[PDB]
Design a protein around this ligand. Structure first.
Ligand SMILES: Brc1nc2nc[nH]c2c(Br)c1Br
Length: 325
């Protein structure tokens, strides 16, 4: 049907215990060592707090897990253990529980994050290349470890713009890649969902994350954030098709024998593929180069199998100034 071009056998070549997260038994330390200081965010499965470890004064972030399947908890914990030491992946310091209620929580290194909405309107050309390269290091690492993140978006990419530190966070949707496995398409954020998800194609792979990264790159170089701003999941595909083209969508569907929900017939319209140069204007032109556009064109493609891998993207000339520095 479809297979990843890279890392397709990673998990099968490793011990079963590497990927069989349902069999993983975490060691749960004592949350009483941590003092919560301030709320940093909430999702439907967790709430996140800045905290201090009272035994050593370390500032950390505590993610308290709430209406969370025990299976989903094991999945996230095992994935984070497997990613230990990976470049630009958030460091899991410990897995802890309230010793009375037994509610589990994850303790992460602290990052002093710069608000992305303001940041993405003031990045320089070099900054964009630099941070995209840093994020690619994280994705190549997790892909090489047999793991798809499945929720790449600005809110999950912490950037300390003072120290030039980037971390990919929130591995709660991440999954192990096994060839031919059919996955749930209800992953990622609307604006960052790949076309495969929007057309209900379940045999996807690491390349989903490369679509999401391409969406981020487009928003940075063009300053339209989010770049593809759908009103719902149906409109999200329409917004993509208005740029990539409708005939081109149909060729992708045909290649993979994908059935299209007939509600799309009355909303997709007919759209030519647009040149990426159409998005250049006086305020973003200093961020756009031929290299940037060539890279973007090779990421924001319908055909997931023909998108650049994270490594291929890192090798692209767009990043040569970063490597040289
Ligand atoms: Br983990 C983690 N999650 C967060 N959510 C909002 N800010 C966050 C930070 Br900083 C970290 Br570290």
């Amino acid at each position: 049907g479809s297979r990843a071009r890279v890392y397709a056998e990673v998990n099968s070549l490793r011990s079963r215990e590497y990927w069989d997260y349902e069999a993983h038994v975490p060691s749960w330390g004592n949350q009483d060592d941590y003092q919560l200081v301030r709320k940093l965010g909430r999702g439907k499965y967790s709430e996140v707090f800045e905290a201090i470890n009272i035994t050593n004064n370390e500032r950390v972030v505590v993610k308290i897990l709430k209406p969370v399947k025990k299976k989903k908890i094991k999945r996230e914990v095992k994935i984070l253990e497997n990613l230990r030491g990976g470049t630009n992946i958030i460091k899991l310091i410990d897995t802890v529980k309230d010793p009375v209620s037994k509610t589990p929580a994850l303790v992460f290194e602290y990052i002093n994050n710069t608000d992305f909405k303001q940041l993405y309107q003031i990045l320089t050309d070099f900054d964009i290349r630099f941070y995209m390269y840093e994020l690619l290091k994280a994705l190549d690492y997790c892909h090489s470890k047999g793991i798809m993140h499945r929720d790449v978006k600005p809110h999950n990419v912490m950037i300390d713009h003072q120290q030039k530190k980037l971390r990919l966070i929130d591995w709660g949707l991440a999954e192990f890649y096994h060839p031919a496995q059919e996955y749930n398409v209800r992953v990622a954020s609307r604006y960052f969902k790949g076309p495969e998800l929007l057309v209900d194609y379940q045999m996807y792979d690491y390349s989903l994350d490369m679509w999401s990264l391409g969406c981020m790159l487009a928003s940075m170089i063009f300053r339209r954030e989010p770049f593809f701003h759908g009103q719902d999941n149906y409109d999200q595909l329409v917004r993509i098709a208005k740029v990539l083209g409708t005939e081109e969508l149909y060729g992708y569907l045909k290649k993979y024998h994908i059935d299209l929900d007939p509600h799309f017939n009355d909303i997709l319209g007919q759209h030519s593929r647009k040149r990426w140069e159409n998005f250049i204007h006086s305020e973003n032109r200093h961020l756009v180069s031929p290299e940037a556009l060539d890279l973007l064109d090779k990421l924001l493609r319908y055909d997931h199998q023909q998108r650049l891998t994270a490594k291929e993207a890192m090798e692209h000339p767009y990043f040569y100034p970063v490597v040289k520095e």
